Design a protein around this nucleic acid. Structure first.
Length: 54
RNA sequence: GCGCACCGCGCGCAGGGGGGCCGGCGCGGCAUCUGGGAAGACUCCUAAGGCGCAAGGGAAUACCCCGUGCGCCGGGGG
């Protein structure tokens, strides 16, 4: 954290959401980067399929 | 009709059959009036925007709140 480069660029930054700050995260601030549970916003046709099943 | 005063009524109670059919309650209609809901698509349809589903974040942690992907309607213009 001391010897980091402020103008650094990685291409995972275009596909990840950073740790933020206490002001952009607020009470839900830990110092970490969130990960993916594999959940997704599912479209309306396939939810119609899943609710005919239900 | 028994017990209580065999110098008395009435009383504690078992309950027959009908009565005053007095009022409440129950059920049935009730031309209207009253209230609520539904309601006509000219009407009302919450606004120039809203709604739904699925994910994401936060909690008064039963409720609720905020703005990503899919859709559904709408206003305006046309």
């Amino acid at each position: 954290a001391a010897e980091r480069n402020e103008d650094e660029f990685y291409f995972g930054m275009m596909s990840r959401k950073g740790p933020g700050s206490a002001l952009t995260r607020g009470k839900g601030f830990t110092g970490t980067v969130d990960g993916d549970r594999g959940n997704k916003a599912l479209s309306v046709e396939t939810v119609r399929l899943l609710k005919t099943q239900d």
